[PDB]
Amino acid sequence: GECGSTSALSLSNVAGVFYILVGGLGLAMLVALIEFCYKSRAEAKRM
Amino acid sequence: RGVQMLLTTVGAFAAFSLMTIAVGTDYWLYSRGVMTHSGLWRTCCLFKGLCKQIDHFPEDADYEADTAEYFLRAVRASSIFPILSVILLFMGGLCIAASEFYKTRHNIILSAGIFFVSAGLSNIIGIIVYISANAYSYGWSFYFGALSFIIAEMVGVLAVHMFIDRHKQLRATAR
Amino acid sequence: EIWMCIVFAYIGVSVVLFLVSRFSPESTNEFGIFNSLWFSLGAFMRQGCDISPRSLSGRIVGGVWWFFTLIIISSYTANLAAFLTVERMVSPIESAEDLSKQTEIAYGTLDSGSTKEFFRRSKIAVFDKMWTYMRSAEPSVFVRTTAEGVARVRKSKGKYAYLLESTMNEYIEQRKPCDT
Amino acid sequence: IFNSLWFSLGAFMRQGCDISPRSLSGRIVGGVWWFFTLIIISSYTANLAA
Amino acid sequence: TYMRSAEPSVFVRTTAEGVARVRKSKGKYAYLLESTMNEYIEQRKPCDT
Numbered sequence: 007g008e009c010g011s012t013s014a015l016s017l018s019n020v021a022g023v024f025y026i027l028v029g030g031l032g033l034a035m036l037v038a039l040i041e042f043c044y045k046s047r048a049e050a051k052r053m
Numbered sequence: 054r055g056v057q058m059l060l061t062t063v064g065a066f067a068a069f070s071l072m073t074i075a076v077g078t079d080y081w082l083y084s085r086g087v088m089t090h091s092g093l094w095r096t097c098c099l100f101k102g103l104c105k106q107i108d109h110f111p112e113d114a115d116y117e118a119d120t121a122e123y124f125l126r127a128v129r130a131s132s133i134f135p136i137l138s139v140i141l142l143f144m145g146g147l148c149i150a151a152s153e154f155y156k157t158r159h160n161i162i163l164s165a166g167i168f169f170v171s172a173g174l175s176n177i178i179g180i181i182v183y184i185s186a187n188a189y190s191y192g193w194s195f196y197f198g199a200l201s202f203i204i205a206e207m208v209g210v211l212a213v214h215m216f217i218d219r220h221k222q223l224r225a226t227a228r
Numbered sequence: 229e230i231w232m233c234i235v236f237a238y239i240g241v242s243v244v245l246f247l248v249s250r251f252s253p254e255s256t257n258e259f260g261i262f263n264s265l266w267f268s269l270g271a272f273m274r275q276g277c278d279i280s281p282r283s284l285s286g287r288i289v290g291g292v293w294w295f296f297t298l299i300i301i302s303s304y305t306a307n308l309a310a311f312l313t314v315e316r317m318v319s320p321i322e323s324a325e326d327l328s329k330q331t332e333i334a335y336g337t338l339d340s341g342s343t344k345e346f347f348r349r350s351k352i353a354v355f356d357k358m359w360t361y362m363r364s365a366e367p368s369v370f371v372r373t374t375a376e377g378v379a380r381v382r383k384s385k386g387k388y389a390y391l392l393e394s395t396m397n398e399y400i401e402q403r404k405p406c407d408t
Numbered sequence: 409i410f411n412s413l414w415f416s417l418g419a420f421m422r423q424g425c426d427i428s429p430r431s432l433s434g435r436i437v438g439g440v441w442w443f444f445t446l447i448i449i450s451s452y453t454a455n456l457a458a
Numbered sequence: 459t460y461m462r463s464a465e466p467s468v469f470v471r472t473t474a475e476g477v478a479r480v481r482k483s484k485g486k487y488a489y490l491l492e493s494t495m496n497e498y499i500e501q502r503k504p505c506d507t
Contacts, residue, residue, distance in 0.1 A: 007331070009505035013314055017230065018185045020303060025178055025185075027292050028237055032171050035244050038285035039167065042252045116485065163251075170243060177236050184229070199232070206243050210261065217250045224253065271423070280426045287414045294421040298449070306456040 057215040064208025065146040068201040072139050072176065075198025076132070080183075082190045091192060093132055093183070129186035134179030135198075141172035142205070158223060162216040170209035176202040234300065241293055242268040248286045258286065272297050327389065328357045335389035336362050336369020338377070343391065344370075374400075382407060420445050473499075481506060 081091035089098040089107075096107035110130040115122060148165035155161070180199055242264050249258035257279045258264050267279050271293050281287055321327060327335055335358070337343050347359040362369050369388070371377045377390035378400060401408050411427060418425045419441060429435035461468050468487070470476050476489040477499060500507050 007501045008503050009501055010332075011329075013311060014307075016303065016307060018188060020300070021181060021185050021230075021233070023296065023299065024181050024233065024237065027295060028174075028178065028181075028240070031241060031244055031289055031292060032174050034285055034288055035248070036167075036171070038248070039251065046252065113484075166247075170247070174240055174244075177233075177240065180236075181233060184233070199236070203236075203239070206239060210243055210246070213247050213250055217253070220253060274422055276424050277418075277426055282410075284410060284414075287410070287417075291414075291417050291421075294418065294423060298421060302449070302453050303456055306453050310457045 057211055057218075060208055060211045061149055061215075064204055064211070065142075065149055068173075068205035068208065069139070069142045069146060071197050071201035072135075072142060072205075074194045075201060076135065076139065077194060079192030079194035081187070081195070082192050084189070126186065129182050132179065132183075134175050134182055138172050138176035138179060138202075141168055141175065145169035145172055158219050159216075162212070162219060166209055166212040166216055169212060170206060173202045173205035173209060176205070237296060238268060238272060241289065245281065245286050245289060248283055248289075249281070256282070258283075268293070272301075274301075324358060325354050328354045328361075331361075333387055333389055334365060334369055334384075335391060336365065336371070336377075337391045338374070339370035339372055343393070378408075416441075422449065477507075 078090060078092040080093045083089075083091070085096060085098055087098060089096040091107065094106060094108050095104050097104040108130065110122070110126045117123065145165055145168055148161055148168070152161040152165055177199070180202070242261075245258060245268065246261055246264035249256045249264065258267065258281055263279060270276075270278060271290060281290060321330060321333065327333075337347075347355055347362075350356055350359065371380060371390075374392065374396060377392070381388055381390050397408075415425050415427055419438065429438045470479060473491070473495060476491065480487050480489045481504075496507075
């Protein structure tokens with residue numbers, strides 16, 4: 007036979023959470039800030 | 054006071070130019086197939102001393118099951134995210150020098166800080182993408198690129214700090 | 229290298245939420261960079277909460293941070309224990325049967341001797357199989373002197389084995405560089 | 409409902425929170441929830457090794 | 459019915475033709491054969507089958 011018959015070390019196999027959830031960070035941040043500048047925008051529009 | 058302008062400018066030019074340097078060369082220090090340098094576009098060996106475009110993401114010995122090297126390798130290719138980050142950095146400093154005159158106290162400062170910080174964030178994102186794509190060390194300019202993103206984030210902290218301080222002058226003068 | 233990325237997400241979240249508390253002024257408790265920074269740190273650790281962000285934006289983002297530290301720390305601890313449990317690497321091969329059941333690590337004796345003739349005349353399926361292997365093995369597993377097998381195995385980086393008398397194996401095993 | 413949803417969310421997390429149930433009736437629910445998610449993410453850690 | 463109608467022809471002349479054919483096929487082609495030869499070759503380099 008020439009084809010025969012452990013301590014795994016994770017490097018980036020779990021990194022997939024990053025470019026999705028970490029993206030969701032700036033996502034909810036940006037969307038939020040839009041909601042805030044809209045709220046204050048209407049507040050200034052109440053004058 | 055003016056220290057905010059100092060950290061602003063030195064962070065813009067420093068982190069921006071350092072990011073460009075990260076784009077240039079020194080992306081991965083390793084043994085080639087043999088040793089060579091890396092800049093995500095071409096590799097240059099130590100015969101010894103030649104160069105060749107190393108950005109050959111597609112290789113005709115694999116499985117290509119379902120959008121693994123297509124989505125993953127294609128996304129990592131052409132350095133999509135970091136280019137976007139650097140362009141948004143030039144937009145950042147552009148909104149800084151534009152924010153120098155033409156007061157508009159709230160709009161330009163806040164928007165500039167937002168797009169700048171988010172720009173550094175996207176830079177770190179592209180860093181993660183390249184690290185995943187690497188599937189024996191890295192390049193100096195790469196480390197200076199990540200640290201460039203860090204200092205960019207600090208400059209964003211000082212930026213938004215100066216912004217909300219300007220708001221403190223706004224509501225303060227309102228009283 | 230993962231740790232650096234982890235800290236990058238740390239400071240990232242810290243700056244983002246620090247903007248959240250800073251923006252839209254009357255102020256909150258996360259208004260300080262030691263509040264966003266420190267509280268993000270204690271958000272990394274399992275240490276008890278100190279300042280609950282009433283901001284719905286900061287709320288969901290913090291939740292994302294528990295998705296982060298929960299899984300990354302969970303894997304750190306679990307896989308960590310999965311590493312310490314393998315404390316010592318036992319010998320992958322220990323008996324001549326193990327030798328007969330593998331071909332990765334070559335093995336042989338002198339080009340002559342009562343051992344060579346012994347395995348030549350042996351009838352044990354293990355010993356006979358090993359003899360058949362060595363007599364046809366390439367390159368030649370046979371040597372002329374003991375030191376030839378000694379240095380051969382030493383340079384073999386564990387890819388070649390040498391069989392000999394027990395006493396000589398003991399003497400060599402009790403001599404520098406003690407690498408056998 | 410933000411307090412209930414978000415405190416319930418962090419309650420799902422190992423991390424604690426500032427507010428705490430005192431009605432001695434919903435506090436039961438918080439406790440049994442700690443007991444539930446406890447073994448949930450605990451067993452998740454168990455399989456994570458495998 | 460498929461194989462006799464398969465274009466191009468899935469038929470080859472020697473076993474090695476099918477071996478290297480599947481090896482270069484990147485798994486996009488299957489070679490149907492006898493168990494013994496499949497086993498022997500499977501016990502041989504580059505151990506890709």
